[PDB]
């Protein structure tokens, strides 16, 4: 992120199209509030729930929420695997909302 900001900052200093030099990011979505909001907004395409969220109330409603909203969801093993995907120690839930055409 720092490199991209530096590169685009040099682009602005050289007075070129900074808004079009970059491309829309394609990445997994994370964060409990962010993922829950995406599921309610029907933007989530796939939901992966950590199996051992220590306060279980944080995810206990998610299977019922995903079922009502018609969002495909899975309970995957361990919080740390989801964390290492998003470069964290922990991730309660991950969400896939958009992918590339080869991965459709």
């Amino acid at each position: 992120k720092k490199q991209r900001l530096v590169a685009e900052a040099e682009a602005v200093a050289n007075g070129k199209s900074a808004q079009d030099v970059s491309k829309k990011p394609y990445n997994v979505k994370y964060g409990l509030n962010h993922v829950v909001a995406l599921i309610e907004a029907k933007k989530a395409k796939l939901v992966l729930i950590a199996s051992d969220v220590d306060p279980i109330e944080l995810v206990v409603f998610l299977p019922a929420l995903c079922k009502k909203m018609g969002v495909p969801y899975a309970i995957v093993k361990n919080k740390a695997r989801l964390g290492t995907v998003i470069h964290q120690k922990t991730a309660a839930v991950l969400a896939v909302t958009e992918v590339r055409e080869e991965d459709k």
Binding site: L5, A9, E10, V12, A13, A18, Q19
Partner: peptide, 17 residues
């Protein structure tokens, strides 16, 4: 484009200058 990065872009451009 993301506005908060646009502010960050201006900050880094100022630092480089």
């Amino acid at each position: 484009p993301s506005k908060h990065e646009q502010k960050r872009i201006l900050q880094l451009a100022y630092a480089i200058r």
